[PDB]
Amino acid sequence: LDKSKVINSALELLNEVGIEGLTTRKLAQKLGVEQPTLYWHVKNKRALLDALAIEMLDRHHTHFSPLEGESWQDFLRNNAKSFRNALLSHRDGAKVHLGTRPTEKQYETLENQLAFLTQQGFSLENALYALSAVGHFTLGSVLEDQEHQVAKEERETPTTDSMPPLLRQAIELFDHQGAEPAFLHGLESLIRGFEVQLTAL
Amino acid sequence: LDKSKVINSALELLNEVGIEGLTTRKLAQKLGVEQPTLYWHVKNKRALLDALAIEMLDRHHTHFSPLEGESWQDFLRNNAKSFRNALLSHRDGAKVHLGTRPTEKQYETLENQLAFLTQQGFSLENALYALSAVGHFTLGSVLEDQEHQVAKEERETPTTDSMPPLLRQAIELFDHQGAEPAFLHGLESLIRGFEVQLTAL
């Protein structure tokens, strides 16, 4: 048994049963191993979710780091876009990443993000809050997208849905566009907000 | 038995057992009725979750509507703040609100949000995007902090760390200042960026 085999079987199990189904007991069963063999690789469900979150960042978070020469605006925009793709990559992906934490192996990346933003003129405090805001908006975006996909299949059709006109125009617009335009516009509002604040200082 | 009683006993059960423990089955036992009697009030768990979320808004979301004389910036700031209070009113509150669909009893409120923001100069598309972004940011801020509170107790305390200096100063600052200040700073950055966009147009 290898870390890569445990992580890929767990991400397959996540897509089969969702996050509440994913338990170390059911993963050991899936792998065909007794619970103590698995415990050596994964101590508990918190360690398994932290490892699945980092695997999804290693596969999809292409802008975890700023690129050399990139503007701070482009970095923060591209970072949220790739982090969104990591959360979308699996069933209940955003719930798997919620509350996770980097390992020491990622600290150099986070340091580099801060060094980059502060080189471009942010205070440490405002670099922290720009990173925090873009990731919290992105997590909220995908948590709601994923749960809407589940919920909309569970709810019975109302006989008649008598909806006032601006609301109907707005939900039809969102449906026609899908989630990405509203996501990108929100993200761009954050970046415009940080630029106001930075220019001011 | 009426729907108010079903909702109040389900909110009491949510605080006792959490969202995963909230079953139609334990709700019936708590109301003294057979499980099929609840069907008529709530057809399945998603209908129950929708009613619980909407009762939390009806109790706590004091800025669901714009208030007389408010600017659009005070309405969006105050809306995010009172939405956060509704999400924090119960155990696993934000998990219950994810993916909720309003009923027709909420449509006047939502139409009035869009009439107000378009009277205050937004296009209907950008009023949808601003409301979307405030609420997604708020859901991500509350869910991440509530998950961190639980996840930090499930990780073993390391004998080794080795944390680079900007990252150590940043996490120390965030912890000292608190997650509520971080939420208000991101909220403000969104509001400032909506203002930059409205001007440029």
């Binding site: 979150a53 960042l57 978070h61 975890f64 970072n79 949220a80 982090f83 990591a86 990443h97 996770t100 934490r101 980097p102 990622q106 986070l110 990173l131 925090s132 873009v134 990731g135 992105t138 | 991440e144 902090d145 961190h148 930090k152 990780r155 305390t157 390391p158 004998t159 080794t160 760390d161 944390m163 990252l167 150590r168 996490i171 120390e172 965030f174 912890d175 997650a179």
Partner: peptide, 14 residues
């Protein structure tokens, strides 16, 4: 323990 207390402080993960 400083190390123990720091490991409990929130850190972003993106």
């Amino acid at each position: 323990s400083v190390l123990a207390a720091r490991a409990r402080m929130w850190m972003w993960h993106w």
